[PDB]
Amino acid sequence: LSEYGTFCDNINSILDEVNGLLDTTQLHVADTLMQGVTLSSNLNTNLH
Amino acid sequence: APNSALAKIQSVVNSNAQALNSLLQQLFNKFGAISSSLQEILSRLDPPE
Numbered sequence: 001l002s003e004y005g006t007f008c009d010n011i012n013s014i015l016d017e018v019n020g021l022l023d024t025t026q027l028h029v030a031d032t033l034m035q036g037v038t039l040s041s042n043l044n045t046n047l048h
Numbered sequence: 049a050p051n052s053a054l055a056k057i058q059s060v061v062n063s064n065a066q067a068l069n070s071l072l073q074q075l076f077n078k079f080g081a082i083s084s085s086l087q088e089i090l091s092r093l094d095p096p097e
Contacts, residue, residue, distance in 0.1 A: 005073075
């Protein structure tokens with residue numbers, strides 16, 4: 001497998017880039033959900 | 049300062065440079081052959097192998 005030396009590093013790099021892209025996308029989605037959200041401290045979901 | 053926009057631009061450039069370096073490095077892989085150099089193949093062996 002070392003005679004194909006670049007191969008497993010390339011696959012690992014591509015998968016790592018894909019997974020980091022998924023993580024960045026999840027962070028962006030969470031930021032969009034939480035963007036500009038202001039809630040009161042008095043807010044109690046068990047009663048309201 | 050280490051801001052995200054310049055990081056993104058340099059990431060574009062560095063990703064391109066890494067992809068080209070990786071493609072160039074594929075010329076020095078052997079893929080199971082006795083050598084990665086076609087000169088070595090054509091000098092060390094007669095045509096059938």
